[PDB]
Design a protein around this ligand. Structure first.
Ligand SMILES: NC(=O)C1=CN([C@@H]2O[C@H](COP(=O)(O)OP(=O)(O)OC[C@H]3O[C@@H](n4cnc5c(N)ncnc54)[C@H](O)[C@@H]3O)[C@@H](O)[C@H]2O)C=CC1
Ligand SMILES: NC(=O)C1=CN([C@@H]2O[C@H](COP(=O)(O)OP(=O)(O)OC[C@H]3O[C@@H](n4cnc5c(N)ncnc54)[C@H](O)[C@@H]3O)[C@@H](O)[C@H]2O)C=CC1
Ligand SMILES: Nc1ncnc2c1ncn2[C@@H]1O[C@H](CO)[C@@H](O)[C@H]1O
Ligand SMILES: Nc1ncnc2c1ncn2[C@@H]1O[C@H](CO)[C@@H](O)[C@H]1O
Ligand SMILES: [Cl-]
Ligand SMILES: [Cl-]
Ligand SMILES: [Cl-]
Ligand SMILES: [Cl-]
Lengths: 388, 403, 388, 403
């Protein structure tokens, strides 16, 4: 079975979930409990569900899945007694109905996505609050929403912010890897303009220089501009920089980092990419307004042909240009399972507030990972403990 | 349209090929000549074929495409009068038949891939040697094979080894062969590279790129070698060097980049950890001994697309990517556009040098003429708007003197 | 004159002090004021004194100077009407007497070193507090002492912490530059052990790997150990690591990072260096105790020959292994002059507390530096200000 | 004692030279031969002389030491029976006389510095050519000068160019010549490099190291060149390339690393900014035209130790380091110990190859024999305890075949 084969592949490479099953699948700490989940359904998340089931949980899952591609995985989970509501979830009203179906099962613990199950539970499905004991939230958007819910005084259950989004060549390595993958263009020997020289922009500039680019930085803060100069970059106004730029990367946290005049000064073939959080830095609406032709040049690359006859290329529709390997999801899933187990053990002692993941869980998972790698480390002596 | 769009993208970023067309497309120096090619077919190589055609050549191509893709690019080439045989080339006998199809056109010049067409011309299709005036070869495997023909006195045409180029040392191959190799591995496996033991067999241009990229991804890299100079290089790059027999004991990934045969033995294979992943970046599929895997395995199964599981007599299962064939070219991003533009420029000028000089050349493998490297470097500078200094007469006499 | 020539050299390359003189030497804002200074006396600090004099100040300086090497600079300052007490300052009681001599001049503003003039003014020389209007303190030790003085409720004058100690290949670049300079040894192809993987240790490890070393990390924190593994380093206990180490660099903030057994396992010729703040990390006393012979191998390198016949080398007597260029001191001096001018203008409105250098001064100096380099930067639009 | 302590330090970290002594000091292959040397004298080069003496050679040395230092090292060598003439060599006529002193000893082999001794032997001291059996030359300037003797038919002894070595490309020269050059500049000037415009003339081994180190220190680097290949390399490294005439207009530092003459013209000099700092890293002091500075300057003065101010007709003052002589060797840290150990090993084996083979060699400049690079790489691996793989017979036949 293709679904079973997908799961078998990931099962080979999720050592922490395998260790958690070895340690807890006889005790079955979640026997008699239901765990409701909203997650993107694929073999890796399936294995999290399977692991929770080995620990005794009744697992009920909604998959946010706009294609049919992982239906084989859904069907394999259903064969293992796990309840899966994932078909037709391209429609928004069906995703919400599937969330309602998870809540129909009166979950004891929720592994949420974006806070969706939890917010519904507090607003339209309050009857589930009786049985709901705790929520684990791994998404940054979810933790924000549940903190905002706390701040209104409406949160009724403990929430753990699993808070594992924190994750060699610095912060700019991922950005340039994505730019290279999406364009297949050389960075060496090119003029790269970086707008903003905070931690993000500096990383992007340093990596570009390591790839062999000549780097120009734009800034509005004189202190930051001096820093860029002392790192060996050229600083000049954007109006000048766009005239020679092969790449322009916005890292400013600002709006309209390029004007209409700036765009009309770009070289034919210039590549634009945003490394900030929102699509306002490169004014996509301005490109759409002034272009005489818009086309898909490559996957994730949009060409805009301008009134001056030149074409410029925008990566990823102006969104953050920079979906994880099996072992990384194994680590994230281990932290999430331990969060649910912590809530199981301690929820009666916890307030209806958002807690940061207890540091003990980070240390337990790290130790388990070292153990699975065969790595040994040092231990503090008595003299060293007395010193610290 | 999709084929044409792919070619349109690369055309915008191939300034040397575009300058070559500007300089020679009116003169048509290759008018009345056929250029035979063996390539991995994709937009960049299509642009090389297009440029040769603009110079007047009849261009006939076979694509080593076991991937079974780029048909759109093939159709775009066909609409421009370029003959392309790339379909079904996963089957080795179909790739060979397509080589024979190229030779049926009696090429005047060959731009080869690994010496494939040239070796056949010397061993099975000797009738084509009459008309064949010169070969351009870019790969280390091809140059080795053609040097082996020379050394035994069987080579009958002049060959220019373009891989000699001074500008090979220009680019850092970690974001050519390295990045494309690791992207392919990551796509086929979805496995983490960070914190893994990665073994690279061979520390030449290809293997060093693969090793540096793996270290960049957070792997601990172990290098195997037979050349002590190369092994010292690996050490000085910060890697561990040891014999394969030891390296296999701890390897999570083993990547072959040697150009040799049987870089793993049966005994090496039986020492691999359960779940080890094996991949080849060399020309031929004999580096990892696929036949040995097939022979000793208790069970064989397809684990996922492009991943074959082999369960061994010791109970362990090892995974082979892409049937031991070269892993990194199927996505069409083996090297950056501008790097291929440079490489292709050198190749075009090698062909033009053979056109001009072949009557004067022996049936030997020649290093790329230095004049070609300098031509292409100058055209690159000009395309960037860069000016440099010129020696004075005083300086020229100083350099020719002993003080 | 050799003193005059030293000053002339630095004068050519201190563009911010030259600009400050151009802007203020007609106004003479410090005319009628005395500025007392304790500083290491050399051509660069002389030029700060000269600049303050051009601004009208009577300048009275004590030099902490244990050699006679800058006596020519002292004599050139005296020729310009600046009062200098720097001879024989190798003796500690003479340094203190020279500080007393500065305080005899009843300074209006002090540019202190280590808080020495200020603490004396508050404890033994309280009569100077009448006329003392403000203190500028650039040293980290000085700011600590004056903050501690504040915390006892005994500080009587405003103090500005000039707070410019904040200063391409990361934090490890300076460390390795120093190790290379002091040993003349190759780093490529060596085994480097880094003890601790906080920001300091990580920087040192990353730079070592960039130099071509094979890097081993030791740690006591499993979370940090995992980080080092995912950066591509080998993690093992120090007891194992010392057996193969060519270099051992301590970056732990701990004591006795190497034991006696660890030291006796080092290879003949191993090099040890501390990148932490205190000389407890590598137990220098233990090396001194167990060595059969101690010698100076090279400047800044001590050899210890052990009972096992092997010799190991310690850099910089176990102190932080990693004194600035003219233009860097120009920047520091500009911030200090502006701190004194800020105190001049505002001291009547300030409490007797330690203030951080006002951000306006950082921005003014940065802008002056950009201006002197001919660099132009961008300016926020109205839309951008409204967005932020 | 201080001299001996300096030598004791380097001896601990020169494993190849120590292994050479272990292997050949009992046999004494150089017994009855004199080896003449021109070196910058310091502990590392002293260890090379010591090692040659352990092999039986009579060693006679002149030190290019314009610095006026390492007398302690000279005295240590004298106590070991090695003849050293290094004092007062700031004066060019004294350095030349010391070269003549080496030639007075009728060396059988010369280890040269820039071809100095060999060129004199051919031009002024031809009587020594009878006994001279071979020359080893490590520098690009030396090889050029000796090639110029060959090309005019004036060379009379075989020369091995050790700079050909495969292992030059091993090390990254930013922490050899680069770091030592910038340390010297920083010592002589106390000026900031970060945020400055640095111009490097020449992008070979020396200049690329200087440029990369400057970029590492935070400089904006501009490269000048006459070779288009080298200029493209500089571009691909992230540097700006332009003609010197333009580069001088914005330069804070100009560093010459060309091996040529008159890399600045009078017109270039008159375009420099007030306060520009000029330094040379080439062999000879003609790269920066010191005589032109001396001729056109309105005033000349010593600004600080090792720094000459020249005030020009345009009112601007420019500063020259070390009288335009090579700036980076005076501190004795030109390269790391282990790098010089490698280089010296190659040189010793070059001498031993000449001892064995000179009767069979033409009076030509030869590339370093590949066998020597492989010997030294293997000894390096052995010293590190590294083992590598050996080719099988199947593999050897595969590599000699054309498939
Ligand atoms: N995948 C791709 O994109 C590309 C593939 N290639 C192919 O990759 C192969 C390697 O090419 P290059 O790096 O240019 O060759 P190279 O000759 O520069 O390096 C190959 C290295 O393998 C070493 N080696 C040979 N047999 C070995 C063994 N049994 N164990 C360990 N090391 C061994 C050699 O000593 C040599 O240093 C060739 O087949 C070449 O055609 C090359 C370039 C592109
Ligand atoms: N300071 C030191 O520690 C060392 C000094 N040297 C010396 O440095 C010099 C350079 O040596 P390498 O880098 O090995 O030589 P190289 O031949 O590799 O590079 C010199 C470069 O200078 C370029 N060039 C020549 N004339 C030029 C001009 N007028 N303007 C700009 N570029 C020009 C050439 O095209 C070449 O690329 C030689 O004199 C050599 O003996 C080399 C090694 C050590
Ligand atoms: N319009 C802009 N252009 C360039 N840099 C900017 C702009 N707006 C903000 N920044 C800078 O971006 C960095 C990250 O917010 C800050 O250092 C800030 O000064
Ligand atoms: N004895 C030690 N050995 C190694 N790392 C240590 C030791 N003591 C503290 N550290 C680590 O050093 C880093 C900086 O304090 C921290 O990550 C801490 O865990
Ligand atoms: Cl590891
Ligand atoms: Cl990388
Ligand atoms: Cl700059
Ligand atoms: Cl550097």
């Amino acid at each position: 079975n293709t679904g079973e084969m997908k799961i078998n592949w990931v099962s080979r490479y999720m050592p922490l979930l395998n260790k958690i099953a070895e340690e807890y699948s006889r005790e079955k700490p979640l026997s008699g409990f239901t765990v409701g989940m909203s997650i993107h359904l694929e073999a890796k998340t399936a294995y999290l569900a399977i692991t929770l089931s080995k620990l005794g949980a009744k697992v009920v899952i909604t998959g946010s899945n706009p294609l049919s591609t992982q239906d084989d995985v859904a069907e394999a989970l259903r064969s293992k007694g796990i309840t899966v509501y994932a078909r037709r979830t391209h429609d928004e009203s069906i995703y919400r109905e599937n969330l309602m179906k998870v809540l129909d099962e009166r979950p004891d613990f929720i592994i949420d996505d974006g806070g969706d199950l939890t917010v519904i539970s507090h607003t339209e499905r309050e009857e589930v609050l009786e049985n709901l004991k705790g929520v684990s939230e791994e998404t940054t958007t979810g933790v924000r929403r549940l903190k905002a819910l706390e701040e209104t005084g409406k949160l009724r259950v403990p929430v753990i912010a699993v808070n594992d989004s924190k994750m060699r060549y610095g912060t700019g390595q991922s950005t340039w890897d994505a730019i290279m993958r999406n364009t297949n263009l050389l960075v060496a020997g090119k003029n790269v303009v970086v707008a903003g020289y905070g931690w993000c922009g500096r990383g992007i500039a340093l990596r570009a220089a390591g790839l062999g680019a000549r780097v120009i930085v734009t800034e509005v803060d004189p202190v930051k501009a001096v820093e860029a100069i002392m790192d060996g970059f050229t600083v000049m106004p954007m109006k000048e920089a766009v005239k020679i730029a092969d790449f322009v990367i916005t890292a400013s946290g600002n709006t309209d980092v390029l004007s209409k005049e700036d765009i009309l000064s770009l070289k034919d073939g210039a590549v634009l990419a945003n490394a900030g959080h929102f699509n306002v830095e490169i004014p996509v609406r301005v490109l759409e307004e002034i272009a005489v032709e818009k086309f898909e040049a490559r996957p994730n690359v949009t060409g805009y042909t301008l009134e001056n006859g030149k074409t410029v290329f925008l990566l990823a529709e102006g969104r953050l240009v920079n979906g994880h390997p099996v072992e990384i999801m194994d680590l994230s899933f281990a932290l999430q399972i331990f969060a649910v187990l912590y809530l199981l053990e301690n929820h009666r002692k916890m307030s209806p507030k958002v807690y940061m993941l207890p540091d003990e869980i980070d240390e337990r998972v790290a130790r388990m990972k070292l153990d699975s790698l065969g790595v040994k480390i040092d231990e503090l002596t008595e003299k060293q403990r007395r010193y610290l």
